[PDB]
Symmetry: C3
Amino acid sequence: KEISVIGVPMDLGQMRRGVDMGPSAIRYAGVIERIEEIGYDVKDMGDICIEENTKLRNLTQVATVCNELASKVDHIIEEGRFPLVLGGDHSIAIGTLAGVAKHYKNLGVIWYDAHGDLNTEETSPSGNIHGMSLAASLGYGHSSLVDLYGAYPKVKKENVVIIGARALDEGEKDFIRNEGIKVFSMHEIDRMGMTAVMEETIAYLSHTDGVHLSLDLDGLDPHDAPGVGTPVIGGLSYRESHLAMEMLAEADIITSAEFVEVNTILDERNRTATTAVALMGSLFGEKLK
Amino acid sequence: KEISVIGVPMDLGQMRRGVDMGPSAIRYAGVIERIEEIGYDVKDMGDICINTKLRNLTQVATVCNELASKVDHIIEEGRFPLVLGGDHSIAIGTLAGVAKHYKNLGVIWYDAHGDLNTEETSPSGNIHGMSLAASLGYGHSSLVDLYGAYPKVKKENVVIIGARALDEGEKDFIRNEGIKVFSMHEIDRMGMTAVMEETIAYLSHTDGVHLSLDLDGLDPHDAPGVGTPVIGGLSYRESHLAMEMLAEADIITSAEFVEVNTILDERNRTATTAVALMGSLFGEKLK
Amino acid sequence: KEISVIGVPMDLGQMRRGVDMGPSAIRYAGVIERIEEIGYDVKDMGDICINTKLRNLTQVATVCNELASKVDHIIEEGRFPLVLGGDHSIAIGTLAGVAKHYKNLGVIWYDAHGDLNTEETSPSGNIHGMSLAASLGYGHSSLVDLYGAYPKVKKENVVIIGARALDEGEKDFIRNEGIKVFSMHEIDRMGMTAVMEETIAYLSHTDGVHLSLDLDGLDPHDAPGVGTPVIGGLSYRESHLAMEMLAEADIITSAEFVEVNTILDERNRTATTAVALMGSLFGEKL
Ligand SMILES: [Ca+2]
Ligand SMILES: [Ca+2]
Ligand SMILES: [Ca+2]
Ligand SMILES: [Mn+2]
Ligand SMILES: [Mn+2]
Ligand SMILES: [Mn+2]
Ligand SMILES: [Mn+2]
Ligand SMILES: [Mn+2]
Ligand SMILES: [Mn+2]
Ligand SMILES: [Mn+2]
Ligand SMILES: [Mn+2]
């Protein structure tokens, strides 16, 4: 019943995408009071203050922020609290998972995203480390990232479930096939329904000793989440995502979480941040009946 | 096939929400002509001219009393009463008038909200957040005993569809009193078709069914112009299908369409959708 | 894997609806480069340069005659004809061209409308509301006998998907001729996966299948820029899935994407969606 929130206003990569405004927008949407109202004790750790290379853009700075984030997430779990990380770009998951991995020996990851973020420096069309954060956490990529806060893979391929994917690069599709990553693409979600997708996901991770939720708001359709770094049409509805959070809450398996890629520049009256807060409310136990 | 239409441009409560414009907006969207096009004889009755714990209590009772008698009289004439809403507190008057003609009356409450508050549980004092509870006999005597000193509807004959913004007190009432409610999560899991089949079967023992359709049951993407929008609601397609299934079951014997708010609407499209839903309810088919 | 693309910027009928802008908007959205990215050889044939009961009948026959002969030549060259639309009346010319090479042709009509009117049942005189009926052999002889004095398509080989704005006489035609139609209510009851599986099975005995995709089949939320928007339509997700299922069935031998109207569009997103649906049709997988 105890949560520590940390904001990471990082917007790095080929060009700014505005996702450094995410933590501020989510706070504007009342995330702290929302979780407190459910009955949690909430500790706001604040935001990390963030002060050439084409294949790995802003690598030194990404590594510096992720090292600080990993140690802060590590210490939140040492204190027995739930770490809730608020994102700019999805490369902060490299630091989040490195910190979480200090405390779990068989960690599940649910990656809720339009993208797989499974690129390496060889397969990336852009050099964006936020398009590499899941691959790096699986142990594939640059040593500065893969060995960050620990010289070992933070997550095992058999413990990942990707939900919402619809903009995978060709090299990511090969990785998924060759490595046997469990992926629910939009076409499978249309065929199965989100209820069946979430039951299969929870069953697939039943053996883990904790589960990290890495929720990129661009998993949702731009109609429901216009304010994201890289919008991709054809995504999950608010209703589907809200139901998914409620099913995860009922299963009581989520032990850490991050909500990333909110971009106020493309948002409409902050409504993507408002939606992110509602999804967190559902994740942390709000019920409709 | 005979329908009488009455508008009630009521917008009371803590503050104006703009829903008094609903009847004018729905008429602008051509509701009369649309119903006549289907093959109905339509009589337009026009519009009714209109403390912090029960806000505007005296005025709400006055309007609902007049509405109750007009709805009663429409049914006495053998006609279907269709009520065009401002706020949902007019359901108190509508159900009081309908209850004069049915002793096991069913109600389908299509709404983002339960409207199950009382004086004690309401965080606002808005009577439009109390109209279902009052119609069940729970609430202020001015409301529960309006146009007849008895409960107008039985708890076992209510189905709420669309719920997603229930207060804690309403959740307790639903659980402790056994109200049948399909929240948005249950609709997602079951699908609208199965929700409506179960609803129609649940009300099988009734002698009539009143449809109380609050446009804020639909998602704000499809119905932006409502008094109190709540994200994550029903689609136009789900609602249009639900109306077609009700039409085919031929169980709806009175209806009201409430809470259209032109101030938040986009080129009247919420009112246009309300008319399309009425067209489906009254027998329009796609094939 | 050879495709020939032709644009037909036709916007005839009672009044302008802006659909003559469709081919330019779809090209602006990168249709040619997109098809090439998948691995196709793309020959760009350019654009064709362009009565009250059969409005603009003479001009429609002229354009449709030219389109039919170009479509003929594409199939004769062993290539896939992809037509980019203004009005849906261009289906008359497309199917006339296709039917020279397919005598048991299937047709998937993806549309909010049936386009099953004749000179007698039309409330408007718009030939774009008559193009399916005319291709079935019903209507004026200028259209019915266009580029061939025979019906281009058999009534038993038609599937309409997405219908929600049928005229009363069109409902009668569907009922009295046994036309297979999936309305929005059936799609909502069955789900799009089951609708497409049933569609594919229904056309099992055709020798080819023409996809005639009117963007107003999609809901105006996902496709605001169309000639005649009708609320309550198919989602982008449903349509993208349907295109993928057709791609894997490998039954589509010609296609047209019509009725994109830039005047009502929002930053060209309807044309962008059309290009995305073509990408799915021609083999893109998620
Ligand atoms: Ca804005
Ligand atoms: Ca407006
Ligand atoms: Ca525009
Ligand atoms: Mn440590
Ligand atoms: Mn991501
Ligand atoms: Mn992403
Ligand atoms: Mn009486
Ligand atoms: Mn209500
Ligand atoms: Mn309501
Ligand atoms: Mn058409
Ligand atoms: Mn059409």
